Ligand binder design. Structure first.
Ligand SMILES: O=C(O)CCc1nc2ccccc2c(=O)n1CC(=O)NCc1ccccc1
Ligand SMILES: [Zn+2]
Ligand SMILES: [Zn+2]
Ligand SMILES: [Zn+2]
Length: 99
């Protein structure tokens, strides 16, 4: 992945309740292939399901999303995976909740 991107500044502190990697898509309620937004912590499905996180990106401009499948982080603007110290806490919390 990229070791940095200019959108890491938009990564916000982890939600009150923590992360729930089994949380369904906030639009369609699918359990499959969800991502969490690293700005606002809404959960929406991936492009191969119904594309709700890509719709969220378009209507919010929020850049960075974390996969509840493989804990990869995608930047929609840089069109790349990103891994950096600023993402360790959210990835560690998601990993603890999943495994
Ligand atoms: O789906 C989203 O909405 C967010 C992830 C994403 N969005 C894109 C939007 C447009 C074009 C390409 C991508 C892309 O490769 N990714 C990354 C991606 O889909 N990687 C494969 C993958 C990784 C983990 C879990 C499921 C799929
Ligand atoms: Zn959906
Ligand atoms: Zn968001
Ligand atoms: Zn970026």
């Amino acid at each position: 992945p990229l070791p940095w991107c200019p959108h890491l500044v938009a990564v916000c502190p982890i939600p009150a309740a923590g992360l729930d990697v089994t949380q369904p898509c906030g639009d369609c309620g699918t359990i499959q292939e969800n991502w969490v937004c690293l700005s606002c912590y809404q959960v929406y499905c991936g492009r191969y399901i119904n594309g709700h996180m890509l719709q969220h990106h378009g209507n919010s401009g929020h850049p960075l999303v974390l996969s509840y499948i493989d804990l990869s982080a995608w930047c929609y603007y840089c069109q790349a995976y990103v891994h950096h110290q600023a993402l360790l806490d959210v990835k560690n919390i998601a990993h603890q909740n999943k495994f």
